[PDB]
Amino acid sequence: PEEKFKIVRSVGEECIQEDELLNLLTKKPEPVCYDGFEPSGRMHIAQGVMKTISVNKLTSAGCRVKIWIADWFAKLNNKMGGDLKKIETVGRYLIEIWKAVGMDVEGGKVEFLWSSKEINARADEYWPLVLDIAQKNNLKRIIRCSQIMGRSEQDELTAAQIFYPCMQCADIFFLKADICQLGMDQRKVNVLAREYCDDIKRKNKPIILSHHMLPGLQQGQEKMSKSDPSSSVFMEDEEAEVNVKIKKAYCPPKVVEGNPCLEYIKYLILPWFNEFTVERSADNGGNKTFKSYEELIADYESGELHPADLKPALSKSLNKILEPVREHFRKDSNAKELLKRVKAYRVTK
Amino acid sequence: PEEKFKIVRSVGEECIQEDELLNLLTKKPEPVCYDGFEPSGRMHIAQGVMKTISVNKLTSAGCRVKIWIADWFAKLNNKMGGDLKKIETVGRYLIEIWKAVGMDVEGGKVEFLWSSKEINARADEYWPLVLDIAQKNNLKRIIRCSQIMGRSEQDELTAAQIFYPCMQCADIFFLKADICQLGMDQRKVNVLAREYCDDIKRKNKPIILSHHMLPGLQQGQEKMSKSDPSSSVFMEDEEAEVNVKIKKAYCPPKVVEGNPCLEYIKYLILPWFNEFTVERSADNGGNKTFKSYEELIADYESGELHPADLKPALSKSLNKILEPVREHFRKDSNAKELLKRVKAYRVTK
RNA sequence: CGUGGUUGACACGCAGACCUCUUACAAGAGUGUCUAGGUGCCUUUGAGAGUUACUCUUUGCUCUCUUCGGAAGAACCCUUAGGGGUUCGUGCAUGGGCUUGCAUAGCAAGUCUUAGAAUGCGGGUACCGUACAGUGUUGAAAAACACUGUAAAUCUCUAAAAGAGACCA
């Protein structure tokens, strides 16, 4: 159990009630983890590789993982202008992406569940939960959750966006989930679920495992934005595109704070390869291999590792990571058509 | 058409866009009318007999009438504490009451539709309408509709009670409704549906027919309350209960304004029996039979008709109206059991 | 846009733009790459009929002499040399004066400037120079010329279409 605990706890940066997590792992052989994904356009790296890492860690720990393809949820936040057909193509594209990048789907522990299909099949189960969750929460509490949409409390919220936290909270119980492994931006809704548990006096509250939000490639971008293709590495970005984006990426020398390249290495490269190799000429200290983030940050702060050397190794590593996805979308005709259609779609806020 | 227009218009006190109503009657042979009824406990007189009068008027005018048994709508407002089983029992009790009092169900123009069964059967049609209606409407607008629940905008509104106006507005289109024949307290949500039509650019807006709210038997009670059994005549109230309630009813002499008994005569006795007879001794001017409300108010204000005579004749007329319901619930075992169970239930606000 | 090479090849000066790199931009660099269009000509053209949702408005596309009497220019038929014959190229908007009420102007309305070509845009034209692929040809290269097609790749790619009201909800 302690090994399982360490593995899962490594997935998220924040864990609410770690003791409950440990008890769950000891007592339940196959805990249920989920994450919810709006098919909101081209997938950037945090959705593909970081989520693959988290999910594979969870499955290796013995957990079952439900990937929630949030198609009506995409509509409610007006993605692709609310066209369910374009949403469905986007979701199929996303599923193909996770398959190609190395999601352990074949292990039989990962299930892709579509929100519309599942809720339609069992609406009698679902909507009562939505309605009650609303009933036990006052309005301001729901508005506070709007960040799950990438929207602020000051935004003119369409009342469908007041819906949105309600069904997302309901999903936790409809899916019978034990671990809420989601981004920090989902935290407010996840907490809501525990609050609801108090109102209904349900002892077994869901765990919250909040993941780090990978910053955007430009300065001061706490999170990647699909609206700026230049700040974000997309799963199907060509090697030249990746190289250019990384080259332009913010990376002041000897400054670790807010250096998005370093977080890319920390959260993407090291968790994937377990090591990071910087290839340099003999005059430049030669090749150096880093097995921990601490070594990288130490040499970077000292100035032994200069951004000019850091970024090329970085780009090479991401290109290696992304090559299987490019190959899949090049070889598989259905994935190729899905990607063509997705790239043809205008991204809506 | 003009005869049909007069008949229908006589049903509601307010009619929005009367001209649209006239065109509707001229163009569509069978206009579809609805009203929604929360199975919220014992049926007080205005829910049974006045609605029978209105519905029979509409059907006599050739309209189709859908009686909406709003059981999820009942749950959302915590009626009977939100238990669908007591809600269903109450709804069956209401249907039995409407059958017994003389609802023209045999005519084939009145359809009792359950919110649960209908919405569950066609959720794909229903819930998108709810979601879009919410999407177009800002939150303050939804809260303003809370009166449809018997709740104020200052009440701690459960977010289910923000659901409630949206679901009710959606009902209008889900039922494909042409005439919203409902109480004045529904007006705000009814108007919402017309506003929605502008937003979706739907030319054919639903006609809005708002009924008078029958006052409670006590002074200053603009509407009957199920929380005060003494102020409300229940359809199954025994003759003695009716007599006592009418005796205690507010009825100052020569004062017409705010006099409930006169309102019952105007809205229940005349529309039912087309006349009302006050039986008096020869020394008290003998029996007098009134064919119109103007005669009633004139003689009452003059003081020729004293409350001591008005109340007995009034109670006699209500007892005559209610006797079929008492007989039904006495003879039919299923109705008898339903009434027993309903009377056993605590009314929740 | 200038300097020299009289001339041209060919060099210097000016400016910009594209491509890579020194990164985080900024900043900087690099001949790494790109930078002549004009000329003159025609062009307000009546009215009707046919051309899809049903009808109406606005068009677009087709059939008759086809506003100043539009085949402008092109090309083909012949033709003594002046010509004719044949096919095609056949667009949109405003004015200001006078005149009816408005202190005057807008605002509501009538003829006139075939259209004040008067003012604009658009398009079709033949010549020049651009490059390119072909062809001949002078040239060891560079450089030079006759012709061929273009310079906006290209086509309502309409399945006529935009609105209003009907079938009627």
Side-chain angles (χ1 to χ4, degrees), chain A residues 241-281:
Chain A
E241 295 178 277
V242 179
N243 292 346
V244 169
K245 287 176 184 189
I246 301 299
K247 184 43 61 163
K248 291 178 178 181
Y250 181 72
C251 195
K254 307 184 173 194
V255 176
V256 176
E257 51 86 10
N259 188 358
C261 297
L262 294 174
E263 293 83 3
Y264 277 45
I265 298 162
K266 188 183 178 190
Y267 294 110
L268 265 183
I269 301 299
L270 290 172
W272 180 218
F273 293 101
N274 309 291
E275 63 181 23
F276 181 76
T277 71
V278 183
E279 291 171 1
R280 303 183 291 186
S281 59

Short mmCIF file of all heavy atoms in Angstrom, two decimals, chain A residues 241-281:
data_model
loop_
_atom_site.label_atom_id
_atom_site.label_comp_id
_atom_site.label_asym_id
_atom_site.label_seq_id
_atom_site.Cartn_x
_atom_site.Cartn_y
_atom_site.Cartn_z
N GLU A 241 8.09 23.09 -35.85
CA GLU A 241 7.23 23.92 -35.01
C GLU A 241 7.68 23.86 -33.56
O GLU A 241 7.78 24.89 -32.89
CB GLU A 241 5.78 23.45 -35.15
CG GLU A 241 5.20 23.64 -36.53
CD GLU A 241 3.78 23.12 -36.63
OE1 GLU A 241 3.60 21.90 -36.82
OE2 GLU A 241 2.83 23.94 -36.53
N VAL A 242 7.96 22.65 -33.07
CA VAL A 242 8.42 22.49 -31.70
C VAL A 242 9.73 23.24 -31.50
O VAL A 242 9.91 23.96 -30.51
CB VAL A 242 8.57 21.00 -31.37
CG1 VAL A 242 9.08 20.81 -29.96
CG2 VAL A 242 7.25 20.27 -31.58
N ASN A 243 10.67 23.06 -32.43
CA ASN A 243 11.96 23.71 -32.30
C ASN A 243 11.80 25.22 -32.22
O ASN A 243 12.40 25.87 -31.36
CB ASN A 243 12.85 23.33 -33.48
CG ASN A 243 13.26 21.88 -33.46
OD1 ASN A 243 13.11 21.19 -32.45
ND2 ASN A 243 13.76 21.39 -34.59
N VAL A 244 10.98 25.78 -33.11
CA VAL A 244 10.79 27.23 -33.12
C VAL A 244 10.16 27.69 -31.82
O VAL A 244 10.62 28.65 -31.19
CB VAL A 244 9.93 27.63 -34.33
CG1 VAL A 244 9.49 29.08 -34.22
CG2 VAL A 244 10.70 27.40 -35.62
N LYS A 245 9.10 27.01 -31.38
CA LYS A 245 8.42 27.44 -30.17
C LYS A 245 9.38 27.41 -28.99
O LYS A 245 9.47 28.38 -28.23
CB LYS A 245 7.21 26.55 -29.90
CG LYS A 245 6.03 26.79 -30.84
CD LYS A 245 4.90 25.81 -30.56
CE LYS A 245 3.74 25.97 -31.54
NZ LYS A 245 2.57 25.15 -31.14
N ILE A 246 10.14 26.33 -28.85
CA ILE A 246 11.07 26.23 -27.74
C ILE A 246 12.13 27.31 -27.86
O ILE A 246 12.50 27.95 -26.86
CB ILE A 246 11.69 24.83 -27.68
CG1 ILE A 246 10.61 23.76 -27.51
CG2 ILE A 246 12.68 24.74 -26.53
CD1 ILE A 246 9.79 23.89 -26.24
N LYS A 247 12.63 27.55 -29.07
CA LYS A 247 13.65 28.57 -29.26
C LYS A 247 13.16 29.92 -28.78
O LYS A 247 13.89 30.66 -28.12
CB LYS A 247 14.05 28.63 -30.74
CG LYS A 247 15.18 29.60 -31.06
CD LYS A 247 16.33 29.55 -30.06
CE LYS A 247 16.97 28.17 -30.01
NZ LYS A 247 18.30 28.22 -29.36
N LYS A 248 11.91 30.26 -29.09
CA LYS A 248 11.37 31.53 -28.64
C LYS A 248 10.99 31.50 -27.17
O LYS A 248 10.75 32.56 -26.59
CB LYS A 248 10.15 31.89 -29.48
CG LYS A 248 10.49 32.25 -30.90
CD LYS A 248 9.25 32.56 -31.71
CE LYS A 248 9.61 32.96 -33.13
NZ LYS A 248 8.42 33.29 -33.95
N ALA A 249 10.95 30.32 -26.55
CA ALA A 249 10.40 30.19 -25.21
C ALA A 249 11.20 30.99 -24.20
O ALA A 249 12.43 31.07 -24.27
CB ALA A 249 10.37 28.71 -24.80
N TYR A 250 10.49 31.55 -23.23
CA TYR A 250 11.12 32.31 -22.15
C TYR A 250 12.08 31.42 -21.39
O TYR A 250 11.72 30.32 -20.94
CB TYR A 250 10.03 32.85 -21.21
CG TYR A 250 10.53 33.69 -20.06
CD1 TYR A 250 11.03 34.97 -20.26
CD2 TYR A 250 10.50 33.20 -18.76
CE1 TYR A 250 11.47 35.74 -19.20
CE2 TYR A 250 10.94 33.96 -17.69
CZ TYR A 250 11.43 35.23 -17.92
OH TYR A 250 11.87 35.99 -16.87
N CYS A 251 13.33 31.87 -21.25
CA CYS A 251 14.32 31.08 -20.54
C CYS A 251 15.49 31.94 -20.11
O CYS A 251 16.63 31.71 -20.55
CB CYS A 251 14.79 29.92 -21.43
SG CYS A 251 15.69 28.63 -20.55
N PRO A 252 15.28 32.92 -19.24
CA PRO A 252 16.38 33.76 -18.77
C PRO A 252 17.44 32.94 -18.07
O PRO A 252 17.11 32.01 -17.31
CB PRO A 252 15.69 34.74 -17.80
CG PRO A 252 14.50 33.98 -17.33
CD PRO A 252 14.02 33.26 -18.55
N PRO A 253 18.71 33.23 -18.28
CA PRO A 253 19.77 32.44 -17.65
C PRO A 253 19.77 32.60 -16.13
O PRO A 253 19.46 33.67 -15.60
CB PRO A 253 21.06 32.99 -18.28
CG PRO A 253 20.71 34.40 -18.64
CD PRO A 253 19.27 34.35 -19.06
N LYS A 254 20.13 31.51 -15.44
CA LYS A 254 20.31 31.47 -13.99
C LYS A 254 19.05 31.82 -13.21
O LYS A 254 19.11 31.96 -11.99
CB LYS A 254 21.44 32.40 -13.54
CG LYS A 254 22.76 32.20 -14.25
CD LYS A 254 23.83 33.11 -13.66
CE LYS A 254 25.20 32.82 -14.23
NZ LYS A 254 26.28 33.45 -13.42
N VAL A 255 17.90 31.95 -13.88
CA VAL A 255 16.64 32.25 -13.23
C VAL A 255 15.76 31.02 -13.36
O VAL A 255 15.36 30.65 -14.47
CB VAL A 255 15.97 33.49 -13.83
CG1 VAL A 255 14.60 33.72 -13.19
CG2 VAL A 255 16.85 34.71 -13.66
N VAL A 256 15.46 30.38 -12.23
CA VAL A 256 14.63 29.18 -12.24
C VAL A 256 13.16 29.51 -12.11
O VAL A 256 12.32 28.90 -12.78
CB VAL A 256 15.09 28.22 -11.12
CG1 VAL A 256 14.17 27.01 -11.06
CG2 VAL A 256 16.54 27.79 -11.34
N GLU A 257 12.81 30.47 -11.26
CA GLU A 257 11.41 30.81 -11.05
C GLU A 257 10.77 31.24 -12.35
O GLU A 257 11.31 32.09 -13.08
CB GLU A 257 11.29 31.93 -10.00
CG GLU A 257 12.15 33.16 -10.25
CD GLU A 257 11.50 34.17 -11.18
OE1 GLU A 257 10.30 34.01 -11.49
OE2 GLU A 257 12.19 35.12 -11.59
N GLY A 258 9.62 30.65 -12.66
CA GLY A 258 8.88 31.02 -13.85
C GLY A 258 9.59 30.72 -15.15
O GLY A 258 9.27 31.32 -16.18
N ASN A 259 10.56 29.80 -15.14
CA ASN A 259 11.25 29.42 -16.36
C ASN A 259 10.57 28.22 -16.99
O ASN A 259 10.96 27.07 -16.72
CB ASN A 259 12.72 29.11 -16.08
CG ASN A 259 13.52 28.90 -17.35
OD1 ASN A 259 12.98 28.96 -18.46
ND2 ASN A 259 14.82 28.67 -17.20
N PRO A 260 9.61 28.42 -17.90
CA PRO A 260 8.73 27.31 -18.29
C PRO A 260 9.48 26.12 -18.85
O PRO A 260 8.99 24.99 -18.74
CB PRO A 260 7.82 27.95 -19.35
CG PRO A 260 8.63 29.06 -19.90
CD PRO A 260 9.38 29.61 -18.73
N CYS A 261 10.65 26.34 -19.45
CA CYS A 261 11.43 25.21 -19.94
C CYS A 261 11.79 24.27 -18.80
O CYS A 261 11.73 23.05 -18.95
CB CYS A 261 12.69 25.73 -20.64
SG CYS A 261 12.38 26.74 -22.10
N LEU A 262 12.17 24.84 -17.65
CA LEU A 262 12.56 24.00 -16.53
C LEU A 262 11.38 23.19 -16.01
O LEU A 262 11.54 22.02 -15.65
CB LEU A 262 13.15 24.86 -15.42
CG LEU A 262 14.47 25.55 -15.79
CD1 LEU A 262 14.91 26.48 -14.68
CD2 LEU A 262 15.56 24.53 -16.09
N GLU A 263 10.19 23.78 -15.96
CA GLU A 263 9.02 23.00 -15.56
C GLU A 263 8.68 21.95 -16.60
O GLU A 263 8.20 20.86 -16.27
CB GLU A 263 7.82 23.91 -15.29
CG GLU A 263 7.99 24.81 -14.07
CD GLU A 263 8.77 26.07 -14.38
OE1 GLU A 263 9.13 26.26 -15.55
OE2 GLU A 263 9.04 26.85 -13.44
N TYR A 264 8.90 22.25 -17.88
CA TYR A 264 8.72 21.23 -18.90
C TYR A 264 9.62 20.04 -18.63
O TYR A 264 9.19 18.89 -18.69
CB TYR A 264 9.00 21.80 -20.29
CG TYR A 264 7.83 22.53 -20.90
CD1 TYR A 264 7.07 23.42 -20.16
CD2 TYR A 264 7.48 22.31 -22.22
CE1 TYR A 264 6.00 24.08 -20.72
CE2 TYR A 264 6.41 22.97 -22.79
CZ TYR A 264 5.67 23.86 -22.03
OH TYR A 264 4.61 24.51 -22.60
N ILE A 265 10.88 20.31 -18.31
CA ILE A 265 11.80 19.23 -17.99
C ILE A 265 11.34 18.49 -16.74
O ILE A 265 11.30 17.25 -16.70
CB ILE A 265 13.23 19.78 -17.83
CG1 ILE A 265 13.71 20.41 -19.14
CG2 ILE A 265 14.18 18.67 -17.40
CD1 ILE A 265 14.89 21.34 -18.98
N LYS A 266 10.95 19.24 -15.71
CA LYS A 266 10.59 18.66 -14.42
C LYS A 266 9.39 17.74 -14.54
O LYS A 266 9.39 16.62 -14.01
CB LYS A 266 10.29 19.79 -13.43
CG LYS A 266 10.08 19.34 -12.00
CD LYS A 266 9.71 20.52 -11.12
CE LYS A 266 9.43 20.10 -9.69
NZ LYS A 266 8.86 21.21 -8.89
N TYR A 267 8.34 18.19 -15.23
CA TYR A 267 7.05 17.52 -15.22
C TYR A 267 6.82 16.63 -16.43
O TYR A 267 5.93 15.78 -16.40
CB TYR A 267 5.92 18.55 -15.16
CG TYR A 267 5.87 19.33 -13.87
CD1 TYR A 267 6.21 20.67 -13.85
CD2 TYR A 267 5.49 18.73 -12.68
CE1 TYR A 267 6.17 21.40 -12.68
CE2 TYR A 267 5.45 19.45 -11.51
CZ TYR A 267 5.79 20.79 -11.51
OH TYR A 267 5.75 21.52 -10.35
N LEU A 268 7.59 16.82 -17.50
CA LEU A 268 7.40 16.07 -18.73
C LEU A 268 8.58 15.17 -19.02
O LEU A 268 8.40 13.97 -19.25
CB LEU A 268 7.17 17.05 -19.90
CG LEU A 268 5.73 17.37 -20.28
CD1 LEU A 268 5.73 18.27 -21.49
CD2 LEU A 268 4.94 16.12 -20.55
N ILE A 269 9.80 15.72 -19.01
CA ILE A 269 10.94 14.98 -19.50
C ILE A 269 11.44 13.99 -18.46
O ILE A 269 11.59 12.80 -18.73
CB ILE A 269 12.05 15.95 -19.94
CG1 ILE A 269 11.51 16.88 -21.03
CG2 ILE A 269 13.26 15.18 -20.44
CD1 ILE A 269 11.04 16.18 -22.29
N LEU A 270 11.73 14.47 -17.25
CA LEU A 270 12.20 13.56 -16.21
C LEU A 270 11.18 12.48 -15.89
O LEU A 270 11.57 11.30 -15.81
CB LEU A 270 12.58 14.33 -14.94
CG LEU A 270 13.83 15.21 -14.98
CD1 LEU A 270 13.92 16.04 -13.71
CD2 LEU A 270 15.08 14.35 -15.16
N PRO A 271 9.90 12.78 -15.70
CA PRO A 271 8.94 11.71 -15.40
C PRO A 271 8.82 10.70 -16.52
O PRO A 271 8.38 9.57 -16.27
CB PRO A 271 7.63 12.47 -15.17
CG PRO A 271 8.06 13.85 -14.80
CD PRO A 271 9.24 14.10 -15.67
N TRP A 272 9.19 11.07 -17.74
CA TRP A 272 9.06 10.17 -18.88
C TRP A 272 10.31 9.34 -19.11
O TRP A 272 10.24 8.10 -19.14
CB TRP A 272 8.75 10.98 -20.14
CG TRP A 272 8.60 10.13 -21.35
CD1 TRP A 272 9.02 10.43 -22.60
CD2 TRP A 272 7.96 8.84 -21.44
NE1 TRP A 272 8.71 9.41 -23.47
CE2 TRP A 272 8.05 8.43 -22.78
CE3 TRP A 272 7.32 8.01 -20.52
CZ2 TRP A 272 7.53 7.22 -23.22
CZ3 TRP A 272 6.81 6.80 -20.96
CH2 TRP A 272 6.92 6.42 -22.30
N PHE A 273 11.46 9.99 -19.28
CA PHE A 273 12.72 9.31 -19.55
C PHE A 273 13.51 9.02 -18.29
O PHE A 273 14.48 8.26 -18.35
CB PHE A 273 13.60 10.16 -20.47
CG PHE A 273 13.07 10.33 -21.86
CD1 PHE A 273 12.43 11.49 -22.23
CD2 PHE A 273 13.23 9.33 -22.80
CE1 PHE A 273 11.95 11.66 -23.52
CE2 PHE A 273 12.75 9.48 -24.09
CZ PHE A 273 12.11 10.65 -24.45
N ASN A 274 13.13 9.62 -17.16
CA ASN A 274 13.86 9.46 -15.90
C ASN A 274 15.20 10.18 -15.95
O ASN A 274 15.93 10.19 -14.96
CB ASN A 274 14.07 7.98 -15.59
CG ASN A 274 12.78 7.18 -15.68
OD1 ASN A 274 11.88 7.34 -14.86
ND2 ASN A 274 12.69 6.32 -16.69
N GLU A 275 15.52 10.81 -17.08
CA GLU A 275 16.80 11.49 -17.23
C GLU A 275 16.69 12.53 -18.34
O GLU A 275 15.81 12.45 -19.21
CB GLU A 275 17.93 10.51 -17.54
CG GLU A 275 17.78 9.77 -18.85
CD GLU A 275 18.90 8.78 -19.10
OE1 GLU A 275 19.54 8.35 -18.12
OE2 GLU A 275 19.15 8.44 -20.28
N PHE A 276 17.60 13.51 -18.30
CA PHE A 276 17.64 14.59 -19.27
C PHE A 276 19.08 14.80 -19.72
O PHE A 276 19.93 15.15 -18.90
CB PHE A 276 17.07 15.88 -18.67
CG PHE A 276 17.05 17.03 -19.63
CD1 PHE A 276 16.11 17.09 -20.63
CD2 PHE A 276 17.97 18.05 -19.51
CE1 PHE A 276 16.08 18.15 -21.52
CE2 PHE A 276 17.96 19.12 -20.39
CZ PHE A 276 17.01 19.17 -21.40
N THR A 277 19.34 14.60 -21.00
CA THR A 277 20.70 14.66 -21.54
C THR A 277 20.87 15.95 -22.33
O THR A 277 20.14 16.19 -23.30
CB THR A 277 20.99 13.45 -22.41
OG1 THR A 277 20.25 13.54 -23.63
CG2 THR A 277 20.62 12.17 -21.68
N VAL A 278 21.84 16.76 -21.93
CA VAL A 278 22.22 17.97 -22.65
C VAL A 278 23.49 17.66 -23.44
O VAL A 278 24.54 17.39 -22.85
CB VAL A 278 22.45 19.15 -21.69
CG1 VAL A 278 22.78 20.41 -22.47
CG2 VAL A 278 21.24 19.36 -20.82
N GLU A 279 23.39 17.69 -24.76
CA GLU A 279 24.52 17.42 -25.63
C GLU A 279 25.25 18.72 -25.91
O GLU A 279 24.66 19.68 -26.43
CB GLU A 279 24.07 16.76 -26.93
CG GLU A 279 23.55 15.34 -26.75
CD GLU A 279 22.91 14.80 -28.01
OE1 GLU A 279 22.88 15.52 -29.02
OE2 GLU A 279 22.44 13.64 -27.99
N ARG A 280 26.54 18.76 -25.57
CA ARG A 280 27.36 19.94 -25.77
C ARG A 280 28.70 19.53 -26.37
O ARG A 280 29.15 18.40 -26.20
CB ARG A 280 27.62 20.68 -24.46
CG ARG A 280 26.37 21.11 -23.72
CD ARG A 280 26.74 21.89 -22.48
NE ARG A 280 27.39 21.05 -21.48
CZ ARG A 280 27.71 21.44 -20.26
NH1 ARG A 280 27.47 22.68 -19.85
NH2 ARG A 280 28.30 20.58 -19.44
N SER A 281 29.32 20.47 -27.08
CA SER A 281 30.65 20.25 -27.61
C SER A 281 31.65 20.11 -26.46
O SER A 281 31.42 20.56 -25.33
CB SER A 281 31.06 21.39 -28.53
OG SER A 281 31.04 22.63 -27.84
#
